[PDB]
Design a protein around this nucleic acid. Structure first.
Length: 50
RNA sequence: UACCUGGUUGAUCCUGCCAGUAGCAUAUGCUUGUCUCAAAGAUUAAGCCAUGCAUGUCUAAGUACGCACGGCCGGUACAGUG
């Protein structure tokens, strides 16, 4: 299950400022970039063996 | 530029040093218009030190929920600057 729909967002409201919400960047989140990095590492291993 | 000169005697020839002579380094005195370089708290005390400064550092690429700013949509995980 994804965790992006449970990140605690803090509401921001300041005197004279438009209100908004803030969420942190989720660490150790498996993302396509992470899998691509893992696959590139595996491909480098393949290339070295060959 | 491989150079000497005065001084021992009544006079002479010597040994011989003293004193002259030129540079170079520090100091000092007097004087000083232009211009280019340029040493400089070593010598005595590696003595003692008020104060300020002399060592900091971020890229697309470690960690950004500081509205501290801030949007080409804001249920956006993380826009961006930081």
């Amino acid at each position: 299950d994804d965790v992006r729909q449970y990140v605690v967002r803090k509401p921001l409201n300041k005197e004279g400022k438009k209100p908004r919400t803030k969420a942190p960047k989720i660490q150790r989140l498996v993302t396509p970039r992470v899998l691509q990095h893992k696959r590139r590492r595996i491909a480098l291993k393949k290339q070295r063996t060959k």
